[PDB]
């Protein structure tokens, strides 16, 4: 884009999700919370910028976008649960698997962010 906000926003969340692997390896367990809080905040920002530019779109394809938005919050809620397991097992031999499931949740949150991008995108069918 040249001024698309919802896009730049989606690309931010995708970037924050992309930065997770290195951070879980350089941060102590205590720090995993702040990292996910950022993903958390970047998501809320996005979900918000979409809600604003939502009434400017066909009052039809609205049930479709609201559909992914609810999906995203589901995604984050799961990422948090995983992150909590990732913590409780910081010094057990289940560390790697916990982190692995954390990253898997994060990847699906970006995949869903991208699906959201596309939905609101194609939604330029109105004007």
Swiss-Prot record:
Residues 1-127 are annotated as: Focal adhesion targeting (FAT). Phosphorylated on tyrosine residues in response to various stimuli that elevate the intracellular calcium concentration; this activation is indirect and may be mediated by production of reactive oxygen species (ROS). Autophosphorylation occurs in trans, i.e. one subunit of the dimeric receptor phosphorylates tyrosine residues on the other subunit. Most abundant in the brain, with highest levels in amygdala and hippocampus. Low levels in kidney (at protein level). Also expressed in spleen and lymphocytes. Signal peptide: none annotated. It comes from the Eukaryota. The modification Phosphotyrosine is found at residue 7. It is found in: Cytoplasm; Cytoplasm, Perinuclear region; Cell membrane; Cell junction, Focal adhesion. Residues 1-127 are annotated as: Interaction with TGFB1I1. Belongs to the protein kinase superfamily. Tyr protein kinase family. FAK subfamily. Homodimer, or homooligomer. Interacts with SIRPA and SH2D3C. Interacts with ARHGAP10. Interacts with DLG4. Interacts with KCNA2. Interacts with NPHP1, ASAP1, ASAP2, ARHGAP26, SKAP2 and TGFB1I1. Forms a signaling complex with EPHA1, LCK and phosphatidylinositol 3-kinase; upon activation by EFNA1. Interacts with GRB2 (via SH2 domain). Interacts with P53/TP53 and MDM2. Interacts with MYLK. Interacts with BCAR1. Interacts with PDPK1. Interacts (hypophosphorylated) with PXN. Interacts with RB1CC1. It is linked to Aberrant PTK2B/PYK2 expression may play a role in cancer cell proliferation, migration and invasion, in tumor formation and metastasis. Elevated PTK2B/PYK2 expression is seen in gliomas, hepatocellular carcinoma, lung cancer and breast cancer. Non-receptor protein-tyrosine kinase that regulates reorganization of the actin cytoskeleton, cell polarization, cell migration, adhesion, spreading and bone remodeling. Plays a role in the regulation of the humoral immune response, and is required for normal levels of marginal B-cells in the spleen and normal migration of splenic B-cells. Required for normal macrophage polarization and migration towards sites of inflammation. Regulates cytoskeleton rearrangement and cell spreading in T-cells, and contributes to the regulation of T-cell responses. Promotes bone resorption, and thus PTK2B/PYK2 inhibitors might be used to treat osteoporosis. This is Protein-tyrosine kinase 2-beta. It comes from Homo sapiens. The gene is PTK2B.
